[PDB]
Amino acid sequence: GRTTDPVRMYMREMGTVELLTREGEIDIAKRI
């Protein structure tokens, strides 16, 4: 439904992204 708890909103906005895959961080560092 709806909520006012800021931590809940942060958990919602952040949990959308998949965690990661190994060699993904190396590729991202390569892009940087």
Binding site: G1, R2, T3, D5, R8, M9, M11, R12, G15
Partner: protein, 941 residues
């Protein structure tokens, strides 16, 4: 229809629905919803019905298994739903929440266990977290467990919780009635703000388990009920009361404790039901109570009978003679008051009691009861030594018992606790006998107050509404005088400017003020101090005074030096005037002990050695020397004080408040009263023999509030004192042992068939003499609560003495000597001095300290603050035309910072005028609204 309205279709849909309900905003997911649901009710870690919970659950559903699991089950939930549906349509009764079969009792042990378990789980979290990375030999089960959480939980519960309060210690009765107190408040109960009337109300199941009348009147009435005399607690925690099993028609002597739910199943006879010496009821029809109501039943219909006529009331309410003659409101007030009687200098006795005094006095650990019978070997004001009888002697021991009496020490209410031996040298004492009388106790009898010769008549309006007129003879005998030991602590901390000192050199005080202090700056023992005298001389360093001009000039003129230390000595509170009976000095380990601290320490050591040495002399040596070294270390080890504090000095003052107008006195029948005048003896009404009446009480106070108990008590006490006076007269002339024996024996018979039998034939001549000597002050009488003495018995006892049976004599006015018409009722009533001394309540303030945020005076008599001129008082002033009075009340006298100094100055030079100004509280309000986003200002500045 619920299925029709049910939006869910599948288990997962329902799980996510309950997840959304429980945790809105969090996107539901399969694992999260399943885990939440399983943990709500079906995981032993986060859900548990105690054995009592399971028992009540199964019983409510009519199951036949009294045990089970602490977690719910599908069968349980569906059965609950089925029974709800049944009660909706079929035959089902809403459970009575106030039923004492539905309310459990939580005691100290259970609550402590729960809090300890909370600490255990919150340290279990940490121990699991640490075990998350297991190790082989780098860890021990001493690093993984922290004591701080468990200690914090236990200390928080025991010290700071609603259900652990300072012990009411101004009485044995108060102590005992506080110990057995039932409260519905606290963590897990109701609240006084939103409790509701239904719970506060008394219930038919309270019979024999909770007193109906002992309860504090006020915000929490019906929530602080007190346990009944005979009430017990089940294994589960439901109050149960005793009953004597009734067979076909015989009242057996076996006792069965019946819970509230078990009471309804049977019909129970009343305690006031006659028996024909064989257990058979004299009357075929008897009064009983089956289910809430009462009615008449045949003799062969009852299953149980009340154990005694006392079991309905609590201990406090069972000490009121003729309770059945008092309206419930007045009995409630009388109990709540006699809880507050202060122990007097000499506790005399209740001349009219209910026989429960011995039980209350002995049960409360205020007296020293012999643990083993024997012969008293050595008595002393401070200790008793018993030569145990060889029968009770254990083989490998010396049959010697030493009781160390508690001398004058402070109670929680600043009253005096002091034990006096009540046995003489060489007397035999059996197990359970009282050796020393505690505060407000007499030979093992509870004695809350004194029995005073009272008379019922107006006497010139000096007892107008409830005021009491007291004779000077009452004050002269010091029979309402009390002792009020109290503590005063002086603490020397370590300030930034330097450590504080307790030196005797105090500036700005003459030699006389410092006469009482010794060289070390602390008062002597036994010094008689007065309000304002210095007890402990303390000075705090100071500097950078920033002296104003026209004061630097004065110092230069008179060549004096501004001291770098300001006086902060502990002075006796104003008004208080007593003698210093004890001084204690606590010194921080690193600090160097002063002269007085060493002198006290040596006295403690010699006392400790003397006590231990006396122990061994009267009576093993190995433990003596081991104990002596242990005691010696404890005395000089150094105290663990708060941080910063260097040394604490405590002074004990022993005040003696005698009596005065404004002191509240009260009887046991809810009859309050405030002493108004202390009359000279010659002015009190007196009888034909010239004996004045000690107190004069208004009779108009009786009929309005239906407490005839006081009148009946007055008559019975008059009869008792008549018997006592007869014995005293027969003793003043050495009549005989035989005459005294005959008269005393006749006194103990007194007509009606009373269960008590006293045969003086078995009393030795010496014993009879002691008995009579103990009765010459009046014959103590017991009047059980609801089986008291009938008025005819009172008249008969009055007739035993030569007193008139009407209970009323003819008095003469001491002022004029003219007989009062309409003979008045005189007798002996038990008066108590309640702990509402006017000395503790008088308070006045011209000016003093002012609150911090709001520049207003402070609270009552502890900060020396002023009275609260509340909103309703402002309305009262507004209703009058008093505008200037109101203005000065709320602007100059209270808040205007510039206003009050100018008003003080103006008064000092006799110019009664004010410059009102603006109260500071309004300025605070303006700055506070402006601290929001609101722009509030004053127009036309």
């Amino acid at each position: 229809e619920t299925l029709r309205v049910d939006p869910t279709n599948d288990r997962l849909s329902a799980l996510v629905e309950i997840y959304r309900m429980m945790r809105p905003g969090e996107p539901p997911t399969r694992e999260a919803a399943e885990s939440l649901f399983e943990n709500l009710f079906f995981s032993e870690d986060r859900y548990d019905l105690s054995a009592v919970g399971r028992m009540k659950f199964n019983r409510s559903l009519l199951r036949e298994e009294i045990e089970g699991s602490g977690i719910l089950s599908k069968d349980d939930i569906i059965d609950v739903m089925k029974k709800l549906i049944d009660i909706r349509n079929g035959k089902g009764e809403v459970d009575d929440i106030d039923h004492l079969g539905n309310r459990r009792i939580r005691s100290v042990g259970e609550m402590a266990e729960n809090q300890f378990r909370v600490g255990l789980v919150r340290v279990e979290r940490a121990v699991k977290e640490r075990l998350s990375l297991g190790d082989l030999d780098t860890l021990m089960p001493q690093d993984m467990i922290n004591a701080k959480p468990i200690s914090a939980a236990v200390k928080e519960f025991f010290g700071s919780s609603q259900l652990s309060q300072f012990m009411d210690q101004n009485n044995p009765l108060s102590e005992i009635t506080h110990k057995r107190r039932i409260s519905a408040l606290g963590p897990g109960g109701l609240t006084r703000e939103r409790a509701g009337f239904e719970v506060r109300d008394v219930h038919p199941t309270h019979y024999g388990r909770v007193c109906p009348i002992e309860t504090p009147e006020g915000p929490n009435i019906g929530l602080i009920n007190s346990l009944s005399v005979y009430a017990q607690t089940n294994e589960y925690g439901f109050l149960e009361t005793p009953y004597r099993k009734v067979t076909d028609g015989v009242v057996t002597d076996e006792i069965h404790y019946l819970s509230a739910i078990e009471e309804g199943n049977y019909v129970i006879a009343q305690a006031n039901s006659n028996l024909d010496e064989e257990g058979h009821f004299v009357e075929d029809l008897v009064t009983c109570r089956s289910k809430g109501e009462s009615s008449l039943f045949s003799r062969d219909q009852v299953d149980y009978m009340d154990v005694s006529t006392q079991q309905v009331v609590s201990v406090g309410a069972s000490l009121i003679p003729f309770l059945e003659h008092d309206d419930a409101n007045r009995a409630l007030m009388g109990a709540n008051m006699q809880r507050q009687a202060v122990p007097t200098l000499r506790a005399d006795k209740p001349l009219v009691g209910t026989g429960m005094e011995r039980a209350v006095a002995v049960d409360s650990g205020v007296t020293a009861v012999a643990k083993r019978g024997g012969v008293v070997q050595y008595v002393d004001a401070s200790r008793i030594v018993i030569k145990v009888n060889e029968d009770e002697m254990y083989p490998g021991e010396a049959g010697i018992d030493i009781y160390n009496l508690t001398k004058y020490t402070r109670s929680n209410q600043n009253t005096c606790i002091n034990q006096m031996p009540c046995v003489s040298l060489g007397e035999p004492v059996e197990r359970g006998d009282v050796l020393a009388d505690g505060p407000s106790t007499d030979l093992g009898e509870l004695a809350l107050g004194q029995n005073m010769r009272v008379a019922f008549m107006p006497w010139n309006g000096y007892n107008f509404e409830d005021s009491i007129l007291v004779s000077e003879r009452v004050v002269q005998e010091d029979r309402f005088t009390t002792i009020h030991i109290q503590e005063l602590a002086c603490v020397s901390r370590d300030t930034k400017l330097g450590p504080e000192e307790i030196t005797a050199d105090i500036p700005n005080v003459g030699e006389a003020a410092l006469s009482k202090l010794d060289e070390s700056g602390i008062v002597y023992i036994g010094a008689e101090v007065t309000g304002g005298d210095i007890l402990v001389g303390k000075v705090t360093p100071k500097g950078e005074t920033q002296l104003t001009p026209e004061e630097k000039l004065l110092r230069a003129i008179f060549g004096e030096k501004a001291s770098d230390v300001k006086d902060s000595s502990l002075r006796v509170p104003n008004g208080v005037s007593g003698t210093v009976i004890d001084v204690q000095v606590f010194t921080r380990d690193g600090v160097e002990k002063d002269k007085r601290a060493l002198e006290i320490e040596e006295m403690q050591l010699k006392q400790a050695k003397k006590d231990l040495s006396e122990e061994l002399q009267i009576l093993l040596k190995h433990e003596f020397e081991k104990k002596l070294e242990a005691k010696r270390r404890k005395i000089t080890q150094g105290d663990d004080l708060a941080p910063g504090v260097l040394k604490i000095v405590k002074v004990y003052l022993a005040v003696k408040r005698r009596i005065q107008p404004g002191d509240k006195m009260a009887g046991r029948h809810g009859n309050k009263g405030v002493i108004s005048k202390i009359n000279p003896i010659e002015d009190m009404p007196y009888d034909e023999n010239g004996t004045p009446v000690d107190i004069v009480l208004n009779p108009l106070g009786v009929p309005s509030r239906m407490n005839i108990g006081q009148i009946l008590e007055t008559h019975l006490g008059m009869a008792a004192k008549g018997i006592g006076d007869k014995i005293n007269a027969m003793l003043k002339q050495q009549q005989e042992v035989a005459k005294l024996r005959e008269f005393i024996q006749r006194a103990y018979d007194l007509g009606a068939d009373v269960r008590q039998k006293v045969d003086l034939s078995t009393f030795s001549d010496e014993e009879v003499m002691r008995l009579a000597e103990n009765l010459r002050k009046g014959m103590p009488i017991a009047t059980p609560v609801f089986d008291g003495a009938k008025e005819a018995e009172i008249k008969e006892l009055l007739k035993l003495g030569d007193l008139p049976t009407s209970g009323q004599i003819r008095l003469y006015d001491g002022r004029t000597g003219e007989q009062f018409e309409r003979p008045v009722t005189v007798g002996y009533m038990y008066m108590l001095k309640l702990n509402h001394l006017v000395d503790d309540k008088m308070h006045a303030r011209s000016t003093g300290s002012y609150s911090l945020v709001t520049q207003q005076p402070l609270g009552g008599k502890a900060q020396f603050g002023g009275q609260r001129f509340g909103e309703m008082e402002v309305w009262a002033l507004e209703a009058y035309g008093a505008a200037y009075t109101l203005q000065e009340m709320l602007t100059v006298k209270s808040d205007d910072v510039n206003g009050r100094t100018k008003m003080y100055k103006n008064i000092v030079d006799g110019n009664h005028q004010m410059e009102p100004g603006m109260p500071e509280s309004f300025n605070v309000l303006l700055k506070e609204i402006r601290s929001l986003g609101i722009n509030i200002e004053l127009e036309d500045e």
